[PDB]
Amino acid sequence: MSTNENANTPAARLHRFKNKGKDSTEMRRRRIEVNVELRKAKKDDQMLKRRNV
Amino acid sequence: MELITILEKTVSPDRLELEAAQKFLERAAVENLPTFLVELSRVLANPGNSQVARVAAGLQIKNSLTSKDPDIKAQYQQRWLAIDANARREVKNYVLHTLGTETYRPSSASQCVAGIACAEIPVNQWPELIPQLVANVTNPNSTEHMKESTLEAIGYICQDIDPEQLQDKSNEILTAIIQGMRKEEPSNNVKLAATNALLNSLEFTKANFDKESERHFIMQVVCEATQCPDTRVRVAALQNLVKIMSLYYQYMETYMGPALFAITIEAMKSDIDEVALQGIEFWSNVCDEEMDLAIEASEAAEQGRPPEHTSKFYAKGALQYLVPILTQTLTKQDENDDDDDWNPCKAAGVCLMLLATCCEDDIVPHVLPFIKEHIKNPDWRYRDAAVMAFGCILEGPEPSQLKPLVIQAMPTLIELMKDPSVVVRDTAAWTVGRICELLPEAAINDVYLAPLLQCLIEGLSAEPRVASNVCWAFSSLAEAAYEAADVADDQEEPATYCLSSSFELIVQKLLETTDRPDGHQNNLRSSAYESLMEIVKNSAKDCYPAVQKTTLVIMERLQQVLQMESHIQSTSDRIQFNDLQSLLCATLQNVLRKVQHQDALQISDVVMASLLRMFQSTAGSGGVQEDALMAVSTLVEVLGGEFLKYMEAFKPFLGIGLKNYAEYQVCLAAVGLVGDLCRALQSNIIPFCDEVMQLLLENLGNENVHRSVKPQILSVFGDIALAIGGEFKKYLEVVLNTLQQASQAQVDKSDYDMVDYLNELRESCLEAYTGIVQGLKGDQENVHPDVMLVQPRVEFILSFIDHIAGDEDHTDGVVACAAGLIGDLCTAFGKDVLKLVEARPMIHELLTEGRRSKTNKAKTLARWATKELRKLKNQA
Amino acid sequence: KPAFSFG
Amino acid sequence: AFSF
Numbered sequence: 001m002s003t004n005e006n007a008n009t010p011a012a013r014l015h016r017f018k019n020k021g022k023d024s025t026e027m028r029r030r031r032i033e034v035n036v037e038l039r040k041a042k043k044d045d046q047m048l049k050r051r052n053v
Numbered sequence: 054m055e056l057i058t059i060l061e062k063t064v065s066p067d068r069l070e071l072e073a074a075q076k077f078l079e080r081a082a083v084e085n086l087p088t089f090l091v092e093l094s095r096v097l098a099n100p101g102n103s104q105v106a107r108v109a110a111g112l113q114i115k116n117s118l119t120s121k122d123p124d125i126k127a128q129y130q131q132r133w134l135a136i137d138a139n140a141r142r143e144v145k146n147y148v149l150h151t152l153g154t155e156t157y158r159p160s161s162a163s164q165c166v167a168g169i170a171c172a173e174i175p176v177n178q179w180p181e182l183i184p185q186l187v188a189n190v191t192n193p194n195s196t197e198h199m200k201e202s203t204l205e206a207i208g209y210i211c212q213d214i215d216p217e218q219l220q221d222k223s224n225e226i227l228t229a230i231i232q233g234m235r236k237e238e239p240s241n242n243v244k245l246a247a248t249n250a251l252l253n254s255l256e257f258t259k260a261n262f263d264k265e266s267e268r269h270f271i272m273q274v275v276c277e278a279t280q281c282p283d284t285r286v287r288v289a290a291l292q293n294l295v296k297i298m299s300l301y302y303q304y305m306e307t308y309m310g311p312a313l314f315a316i317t318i319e320a321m322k323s324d325i326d327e328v329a330l331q332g333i334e335f336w337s338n339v340c341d342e343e344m345d346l347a348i349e350a351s352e353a354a355e356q357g358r359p360p361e362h363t364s365k366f367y368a369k370g371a372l373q374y375l376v377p378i379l380t381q382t383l384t385k386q387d388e389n390d391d392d393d394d395w396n397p398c399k400a401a402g403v404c405l406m407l408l409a410t411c412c413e414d415d416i417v418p419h420v421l422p423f424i425k426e427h428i429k430n431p432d433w434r435y436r437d438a439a440v441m442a443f444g445c446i447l448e449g450p451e452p453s454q455l456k457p458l459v460i461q462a463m464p465t466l467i468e469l470m471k472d473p474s475v476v477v478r479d480t481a482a483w484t485v486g487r488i489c490e491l492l493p494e495a496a497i498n499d500v501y502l503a504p505l506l507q508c509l510i511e512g513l514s515a516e517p518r519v520a521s522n523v524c525w526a527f528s529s530l531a532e533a534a535y536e537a538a539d540v541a542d543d544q545e546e547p548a549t550y551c552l553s554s555s556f557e558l559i560v561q562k563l564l565e566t567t568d569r570p571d572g573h574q575n576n577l578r579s580s581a582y583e584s585l586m587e588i589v590k591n592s593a594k595d596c597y598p599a600v601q602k603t604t605l606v607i608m609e610r611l612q613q614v615l616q617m618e619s620h621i622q623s624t625s626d627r628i629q630f631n632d633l634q635s636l637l638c639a640t641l642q643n644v645l646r647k648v649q650h651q652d653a654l655q656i657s658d659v660v661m662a663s664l665l666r667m668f669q670s671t672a673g674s675g676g677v678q679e680d681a682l683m684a685v686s687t688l689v690e691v692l693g694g695e696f697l698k699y700m701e702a703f704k705p706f707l708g709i710g711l712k713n714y715a716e717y718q719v720c721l722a723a724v725g726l727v728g729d730l731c732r733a734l735q736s737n738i739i740p741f742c743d744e745v746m747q748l749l750l751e752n753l754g755n756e757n758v759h760r761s762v763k764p765q766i767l768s769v770f771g772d773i774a775l776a777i778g779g780e781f782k783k784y785l786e787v788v789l790n791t792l793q794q795a796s797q798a799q800v801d802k803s804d805y806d807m808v809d810y811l812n813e814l815r816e817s818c819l820e821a822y823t824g825i826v827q828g829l830k831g832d833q834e835n836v837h838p839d840v841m842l843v844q845p846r847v848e849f850i851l852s853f854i855d856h857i858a859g860d861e862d863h864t865d866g867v868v869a870c871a872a873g874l875i876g877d878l879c880t881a882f883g884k885d886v887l888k889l890v891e892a893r894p895m896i897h898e899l900l901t902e903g904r905r906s907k908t909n910k911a912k913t914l915a916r917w918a919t920k921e922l923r924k925l926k927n928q929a
Numbered sequence: 930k931p932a933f934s935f936g
Numbered sequence: 937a938f939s940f
Contacts, residue, residue, distance in 0.1 A: 010395040
């Protein structure tokens with residue numbers, strides 16, 4: 001459907017080599033998204049205690 | 054004074070003349086800009102002047118017309134368009150006359166033409182320019198310098214215009230370019246200029262490339278410049294053969310067979326770097342496109358529909374020719390090399406990895422004899438290539454037939470991680486890390502588990518290029534062992550796993566690896582910290598006193614860093630310092646998530662004092678503010694209702710986190726913290742919420758903040774409604790009016806980058822409505838009378854859910870939240886809702902679409918809502 | 930000869 | 937047709 005990222009290929013493909021594509025910014029944004037998802041699951045769990053389904 | 058002498062003085066090495074001449078040139082540009090431009094055009098067009106003065110004259114025109122900052126470029130084009138048309142015609146005439154009036158080959162006139170045309174081709178104020186350029190190229194009466202400069206001007210133009218304007222004029226410049234790129238031109242500079250021009254003039258040539266007889270000619274003429282003896286022409290022709298494959302797949306069936314295959318293979322086998330690199334990159338792009346086509350061929354086949362585009366399977370058909378070249382290329386490695394230097398040996402590994410994930414189970418019988426014959430070989434390049442070629446093929450095929458290979462390949466890699474050569478050690482550490490990542494249960498097997506741990510603990514002390522590769526293997530191994538024990542150990546948390554006998558000393562060696570003085574090389578400090586976080590998070594119940602020791606050590610380090618801020622002097626000091634603070638904050642989060650509550654109570658005051666001091670003393674810098682807010686959020690979550698003793702000292706920092714709307718990520722963290730804070734503190738959040746609601750309404754009032762902040766504020770309004778309950782009536786009318794205004798907003802359907810935002814805001818509004826209804830409903834067995842303050846809005850809410858029910862495109866969270874709101878409205882009021890819900894059929898469609906969906910919470914909430922609705926309907 | 934043109 |  002959409003289009004993937006391109007950029008200049010000596011810098012674009014270089015982050016697929018070994019463990020080059022794991023700098024501090026990428027690990028930080030991964031730590032953002034897991035932290036968001038556990039809060040979402042906490043709210044979804046906490047809501048159903050009121051309704052009793 | 055003539056300006057020629059001023060330019061010659063500006064080129065001169067003495068600053069005593071240079072600065073005065075430069076200031077005179079600037080004052081000439083300020084005093085009368087078009088007269089200065091006219092005189093410089095007169096200087097440029099004369100063949101009798103010195104070439105240095107002409108190039109220095111053209112430099113000012115190039116600087117005046119174009120710039121790299123886009124707003125500066127826009128106002129520069131506007132200030133060009135403000136000049137009278139006759140003077141603009143004079144400089145247009147002189148600059149167009151200059152082409153061909155220079156014997157040197159780099160010329161300023163082509164870039165001057167490009168800037169002039171970029172300033173006014175969207176307004177059609179120069180119709181003669183494209184016929185003049187096409188006529189200059191097409192004229193058979195020689196002058197190679199003019200032809201080269203015109204083709205370079207066309208190539209300069211085609212990369213700077215917005216493509217929607219050149220779509221009008223795409224029939225003539227293609228004629229000029231393909232006339233210039235033909236085989237009979239003797240000068241190779243002309244061929245090189247036309248070949249570099251076609252690479253830019255490609256995105257807006259879709260109508261030409263769709264017609265059969267034109268694209269046949271374009272492909273035939275590009276397929277001749279790959280056989281030029283100049284080699285720069287070879288590189289420039291392969292470079293857009295790659296782009297043609299990338300953009301116009303499904304046209305390539307006629308050409309790929311009896312042309313492009315042989316060209317690309319023979320380019321791969323070359324001994325020149327930049328010519329083999331493009332031959333690798335072509336097949337890498339083919340492997341990208343043929344994986345996307347397979348994803349869509351599965352997705353459409355799930356719904357029973359044929360897909361839009363079928364694949365042709367080029368990469369699967371080319372394996373037996375690609376693999377013996379790709380393996381052989383891996384040996385071309387120098388005895389001294391650099392990490393960031395892209396080269397064909399570094400490209401062949403990435404192409405082999407992509408080929409493995411594309412072709413899957415078929416790649417192994419072509420790779421395995423190479424590793425089998427070159428694992429034992431007294432030469433470090435062939436052994437390093439064998440280890441890398443073994444490590445690339447892991448993610449492709451089926452693990453059930455891939456684990457017996459690595460089971461008997463482990464004792465070779467255990468020995469090979471203690472090699473004389475550093476490069477083989479680094480590659481062996483990488484392949485061991487991939488073994489832990491992709492095939493985890495084959496590594497946990499206790500035949501080789503203790504020597505593997507011994508090898509990794511020994512290799513944590515070696516060179517910085519291999520310790521960093523060891524750290525990711527440790528991070529993967531911890532999760533592998535924890536998940537293997539978590540299957541066995543029942544309900545909550547595993548009591549004892551494979552690494553609990555060795556968790557001590559592993560943790561100690563990581564804490565040693567953190568404090569190396571050479572930690573700035575190859576991400577050593579950060580990779581050690583990420584490994585430490587991943588090992589602490591996946592610990593067993595046996596390993597808890599070690600976690601106590603690590604908590605003490607981490608808090609000691611965090612107390613040390615707060616005194617270190619005044620010793621910073623340079624930019625690199627701040628760059629390393631901010632990374633250190635971010636890593637320490639994330640490690641503190643992972644420590645706080647794991648410690649027991651009775652021990653979590655004891656460290657809380659010094660943790661909040663250090664977080665408050667690092668929030669105060671640091672001069673913003675964004676990332677430490679975000680990490681401080683998220684660390685406080687996890688501290689609030691683990692501490693529960695006992696957090697309120699720290700609240701009144703935290704309140705102004707919460708306020709300034711909300712009030713500062715310049716950066717949106719810090720206020721996103723602040724509103725998420727407000728949600729967590731009210732959800733933890735429940736009814737005790739009453740005296741602090743007036744400033745919070747005022748700041749949230751002020752943030753809703755501003756119209757230049759980022760759009761992504763707006764969905765979260767409505768959801769935390771729902772959360773504070775649920776936390777407060779009966780005292781929400783003083784804010785109820787205001788938040789209901791803002792919810793009405795938010796629900797009455799709509800946006801265009803044309804882009805999914807707006808449709809996704811529309812779905813997100815719709816989910817937020819539905820969550821806010823469920824929050825206010827459940828908050829006013831109360832916690833008792835009978836509904837409170839305060840729900841009847843919402844009863845005029847029920848028809849509005851039902852019309853709103855009818856309006857979203859009428860749409861044909863939905864995210865599943867929309868129907869999942871809407872079913873819950875319908876259930877809340879069924880429980881909220883009496884039988885009067887029935888004569889309103891019977892009038893709209895699309896909600897009854899949605900309550901079946903939720904149950905037939907595959908996402909589980911939509912099914913459960915829709916079942917609950919339709920159960921309440923059927924219970925209400927049967928009570929006639 | 931230029932021979933070919935696009936239109 | 938195509939005649940490389």
